[PDB]
Amino acid sequence: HNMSVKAMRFPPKSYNKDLESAEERREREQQDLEFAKEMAEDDDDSFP
Amino acid sequence: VIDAFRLINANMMVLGHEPRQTTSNLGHLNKPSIQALIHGLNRHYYSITINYRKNELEQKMLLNLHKKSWMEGLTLQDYSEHCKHNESVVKEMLELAKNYNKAVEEEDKMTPEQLAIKNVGKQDPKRHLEEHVDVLMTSNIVQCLAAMLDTVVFK
Amino acid sequence: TRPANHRQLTFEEIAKSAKITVNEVELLVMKALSVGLVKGSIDEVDKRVHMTWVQPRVLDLQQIKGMKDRLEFWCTDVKSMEMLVEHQAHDILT
Amino acid sequence: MPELAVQKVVVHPLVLLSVVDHFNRIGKVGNQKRVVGVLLGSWQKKVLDVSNSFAVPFDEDDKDDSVWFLDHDYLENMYGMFKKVNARERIVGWYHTGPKLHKNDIAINELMKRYCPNSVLVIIDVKPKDLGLPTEAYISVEEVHDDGTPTSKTFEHVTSEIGAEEAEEVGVEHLLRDIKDTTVGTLSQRITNQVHGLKGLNSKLLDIRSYLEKVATGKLPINHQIIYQLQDVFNLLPDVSLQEFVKAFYLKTNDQMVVVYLASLIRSVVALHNLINNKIANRDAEKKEGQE
Amino acid sequence: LLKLFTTMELMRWSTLVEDYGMELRKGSLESPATDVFGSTEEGEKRWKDLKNRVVEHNIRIMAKYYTRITMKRMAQLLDLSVDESEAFLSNLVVNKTIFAKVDRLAGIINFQRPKDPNNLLNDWSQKLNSLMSLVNKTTHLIAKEEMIHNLQ
Amino acid sequence: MVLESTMVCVDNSEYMRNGDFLPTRLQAQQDAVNIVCHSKTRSNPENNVGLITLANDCEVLTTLTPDTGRILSKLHTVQPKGKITFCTGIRVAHLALKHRQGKNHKMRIIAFVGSPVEDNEKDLVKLAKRLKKEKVNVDIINFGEEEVNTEKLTAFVNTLNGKDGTGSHLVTVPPGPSLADALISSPILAGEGGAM
Numbered sequence: 001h002n003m004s005v006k007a008m009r010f011p012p013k014s015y016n017k018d019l020e021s022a023e024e025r026r027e028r029e030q031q032d033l034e035f036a037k038e039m040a041e042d043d044d045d046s047f048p
Numbered sequence: 049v050i051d052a053f054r055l056i057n058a059n060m061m062v063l064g065h066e067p068r069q070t071t072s073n074l075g076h077l078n079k080p081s082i083q084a085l086i087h088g089l090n091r092h093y094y095s096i097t098i099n100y101r102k103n104e105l106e107q108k109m110l111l112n113l114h115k116k117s118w119m120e121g122l123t124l125q126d127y128s129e130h131c132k133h134n135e136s137v138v139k140e141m142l143e144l145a146k147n148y149n150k151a152v153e154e155e156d157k158m159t160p161e162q163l164a165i166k167n168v169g170k171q172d173p174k175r176h177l178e179e180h181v182d183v184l185m186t187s188n189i190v191q192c193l194a195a196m197l198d199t200v201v202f203k
Numbered sequence: 204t205r206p207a208n209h210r211q212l213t214f215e216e217i218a219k220s221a222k223i224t225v226n227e228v229e230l231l232v233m234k235a236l237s238v239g240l241v242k243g244s245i246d247e248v249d250k251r252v253h254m255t256w257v258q259p260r261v262l263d264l265q266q267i268k269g270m271k272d273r274l275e276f277w278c279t280d281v282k283s284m285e286m287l288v289e290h291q292a293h294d295i296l297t
Numbered sequence: 298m299p300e301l302a303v304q305k306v307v308v309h310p311l312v313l314l315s316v317v318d319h320f321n322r323i324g325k326v327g328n329q330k331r332v333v334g335v336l337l338g339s340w341q342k343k344v345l346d347v348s349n350s351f352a353v354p355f356d357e358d359d360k361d362d363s364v365w366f367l368d369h370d371y372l373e374n375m376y377g378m379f380k381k382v383n384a385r386e387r388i389v390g391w392y393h394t395g396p397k398l399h400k401n402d403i404a405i406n407e408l409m410k411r412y413c414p415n416s417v418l419v420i421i422d423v424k425p426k427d428l429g430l431p432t433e434a435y436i437s438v439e440e441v442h443d444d445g446t447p448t449s450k451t452f453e454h455v456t457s458e459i460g461a462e463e464a465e466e467v468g469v470e471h472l473l474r475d476i477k478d479t480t481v482g483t484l485s486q487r488i489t490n491q492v493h494g495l496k497g498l499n500s501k502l503l504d505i506r507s508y509l510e511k512v513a514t515g516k517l518p519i520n521h522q523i524i525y526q527l528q529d530v531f532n533l534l535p536d537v538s539l540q541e542f543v544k545a546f547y548l549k550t551n552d553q554m555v556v557v558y559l560a561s562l563i564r565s566v567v568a569l570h571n572l573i574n575n576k577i578a579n580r581d582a583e584k585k586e587g588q589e
Numbered sequence: 590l591l592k593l594f595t596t597m598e599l600m601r602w603s604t605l606v607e608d609y610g611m612e613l614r615k616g617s618l619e620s621p622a623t624d625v626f627g628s629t630e631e632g633e634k635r636w637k638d639l640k641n642r643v644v645e646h647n648i649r650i651m652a653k654y655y656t657r658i659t660m661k662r663m664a665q666l667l668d669l670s671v672d673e674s675e676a677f678l679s680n681l682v683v684n685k686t687i688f689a690k691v692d693r694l695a696g697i698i699n700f701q702r703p704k705d706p707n708n709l710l711n712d713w714s715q716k717l718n719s720l721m722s723l724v725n726k727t728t729h730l731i732a733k734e735e736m737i738h739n740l741q
Numbered sequence: 742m743v744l745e746s747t748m749v750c751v752d753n754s755e756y757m758r759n760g761d762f763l764p765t766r767l768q769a770q771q772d773a774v775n776i777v778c779h780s781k782t783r784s785n786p787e788n789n790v791g792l793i794t795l796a797n798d799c800e801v802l803t804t805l806t807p808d809t810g811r812i813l814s815k816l817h818t819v820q821p822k823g824k825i826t827f828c829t830g831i832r833v834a835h836l837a838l839k840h841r842q843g844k845n846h847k848m849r850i851i852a853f854v855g856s857p858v859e860d861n862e863k864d865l866v867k868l869a870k871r872l873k874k875e876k877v878n879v880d881i882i883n884f885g886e887e888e889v890n891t892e893k894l895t896a897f898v899n900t901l902n903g904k905d906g907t908g909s910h911l912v913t914v915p916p917g918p919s920l921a922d923a924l925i926s927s928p929i930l931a932g933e934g935g936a937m
Contacts, residue, residue, distance in 0.1 A: 001565045004572050011575035047087040108425035115430035117497025120490040122721050128707040185560045186484050201284050208537050248657040259528040271509045285495040296485035356836040366836035370804045400741045454729035508731045520734050533720045545706040
């Protein structure tokens with residue numbers, strides 16, 4: 001049970017070789033939605 | 049959650065010191081209170097920042113939560129209370145086992161989207177054989193050492 | 204007097220110091236097991252008594268000095284055993 | 298007490314912090330001194346849940362024992378000040394900053410008792426050092442003795458510990474993210490309990506050994522009672538039923554392994570099936586790694 | 590007569606008959622209570638029953654003071670015949686009063702149930718428990734005393 | 742005057758049941774206190790008055806407070822009993838004078854004594870050196886205890902006077918019926934210049 005996890009380690013490693021910080025344009029699109037949301041709530045407040 | 053606030057002279061803001069209520073604070077951004085913080089942070093008050101002072105004497109005080117010189121290791125549960133525990137678990141092992149075979153035949157003949165959304169009766173999979181073995185074991189191992197240790201300690 | 208595992212007395216061993224034959228001694232132990240001076244059991248067939256607990260009674264400065272070293276002796280057992288599971292167990296586990 | 302109206306005294310963390318803050322309020326050159334406050338709390342069974350406390354101006358001669366001063370008027374003002382803020386806050390006792398008991402204590406216990414019968418002391422420490430809790434609880438009872446000496450106001454020990462609320466919980470939680478104690482999982486947590494327990498037995502016994510050695514030589518008049526109890530101790534040690542006990546203990550262990558065996562085995566099979574899952578996911582990831 | 594039945598000490602049926610049979614014959618209740626012990630209509634079943642209760646009192650005490658015991662010795666601690674004293678033990682065994690186990694060919698009664706592990710170790714555990722607590726009260730006692738002799 | 746901390750030491754003793762003064766010396770003691778407190782809340786507009794006992798283990802019945810009305814209301818329920826002590830009482834008086842609002846008040850003890858003192862003079866004139874350090878003034882009112890006592894208290898009040906005659910003075914009250922000696926011998930006009 002220590003042995004076969006210690007060899008199971010390698011399959012996860014090939015996947016980590018695949019990006020695990022990818023889809024940065026999704027996150028940048030969300031960030032461009034939080035500037036529209038921030039001001040959506042200053043306009044639902046209706047307060048400057 | 050704990051903030052701090054200080055009102056700001058709204059009059060002086062109207063008079064042109066509106067960009068002059070900026071004292072030099074650091075920052076970290078808030079939102080859900082933008083309700084009254086859009087004229088709060090930016091008209092009526094602002095955000096102070098909070099810290100703490102973790103003394104070492106207070107830390108060595110709170111750190112206390114167990115007086116064990118009569119707890120475990122000088123005790124151990126009842127050995128007829130402890131067999132009635134094993135009985136129950138190691139029977140539940142059987143019940144779960146069967147369903148486990150029936151899951152290993154299924155997963156083989158299906159694609160991971162249908163085993164993904166499989167959230168009806170979580171009693172079937174690994175999750176419960178692990179959930180068990182780590183309570184069972186624990187128990188028992190130590191269940192285990194407690195008896196031995198006392199045999200020498202109070203020899 | 205008997206300090207150890209050896210805590211059994213034989214009927215014909217009590218009777219000789221109690222000055223009475225072995226047909227009184229039975230009752231005699233039963234009054235003790237009643238008032239409480241003794242807790243335990245008579246094993247009549249093999250002529251044994253089981254002296255499990257005997258009320259305390261005052262000691263002097265010479266008996267205490269022996270208890271000190273009897274207790275000391277137990278202390279170092281504890282010390283060494285703690286030192287057994289600080290090595291190994293505490294080391295890794297925490 | 299003989300009364301089942303006291304037993305578990307449970308002090309919440311903010312009290313501990315409160316007496317440890319009080320000990321530095323006075324702390325100028327008046328430090329190195331017993332400081333005393335009153336314990337506010339609630340209770341309704343075998344408990345005395347302590348919650349709030351506030352220093353009471355207190356002085357005490359450093360060589361005499363009948364020269365102690367305690368502004369009880371201050372109490373009859375503040376007690377109401379805090380009642381006016383929280384109902385259900387009677388005076389359930391009073392705390393005394395250790396390091397241990399003083400002859401004078403009993404005197405105090407009767408100038409605090411003029412409020413609430415059952416008042417208890419709660420010796421709290423101003424120095425972390427003990428490995429058990431820094432919270433010992435005493436009650437002022439009285440008894441008769443087989444030696445025929447006049448009745449006395451002694452002090453009797455009752456078990457103690459600290460508890461918490463959600464509030465308390467969370468504040469403490471917040472204050473110990475520096476000294477993390479959660480990285481440690483279950484199994485090891487309880488091994489810790491069983492080594493740390495010997496760390497207690499060891500020093501308790503050690504203290505009795507220093508006492509016995511203290512009366513035997515370097516004389517300190519014998520108190521027959523201590524030695525009495527100390528005999529029950531050596532009769533209770535597990536010994537006289539040696540052979541049989543052996544043959545049984547071995548058997549119960551045997552069972553224990555049987556079930557450990559099963560546990561570790563299932564664990565193994567499950568982990569291995571996990572591995573098969575990794576290998577197959579790797580093959581099908583290798584068909585994708587090709588393509589275009 | 591009640592001070593005999595409360596304490597835990599066996600009673601001779603002969604010493605009971607002697608120094609009390611004259612108290613159960615003068616001033617008795619043979620009509621104000623319907624033959625407490627007089628006559629022979631029901632007043633005989635009464636003696637027989639009283640004898641039972643006396644003797645089974647004795648057995649009930651055997652169960653706290655004996656593991657083994659010889660059959661012969663038992664008969665003299667019951668003042669019954671050596672043969673009638675197995676016939677009188679069944680009245681209690683099967684039933685619900687002390688299921689002591691006898692061996693006839695042996696001559697031995699055993700008032701100790703078979704010892705299994707759960708017993709033996711749950712006694713070891715009781716003792717380590719009380720041992721622990723007792724060390725606690727000891728250290729607190731020594732503490733208290735420290736204050737009287739060093740005069741704090 | 743200046744704002745001061747006053748400590749009324751009243752005595753409990755079997756001697757406080759003598760008809761040799763105003764009806765019973767108990768009652769009379771009460772009246773005397775009632776005047777010496779009131780008379781030091783009009784010298785200054787603010788002035789803290791205490792009230793301890795001098796018997797058994799010397800005790801506090803009220804700490805420093807400006808209300809003469811508490812000083813008179815606890816004082817009703819005393820009882821003549823016990824054997825007084827001067828040592829214990831004085832020493833608890835300091836501990837009561839330290840704790841006060843404001844540290845500009847002066848330390849003054851107004852002490853009434855009334856039964857033979859059983860402490861030797863050697864210890865009393867050690868306490869008077871510790872009071873000389875602590876700058877404690879102490880007036881001793883011999884309401885009795887002058888013919889049944891050779892005044893060790895003379896060497897007590899002269900241990901506090903290196904040169905000042907107000908630093909500490911032992912006031913006597915003639916032991917006759919003397920209605921008019923417990924009112925003029927008061928410490929606010931016996932051993933000082935002020936009389937307000």
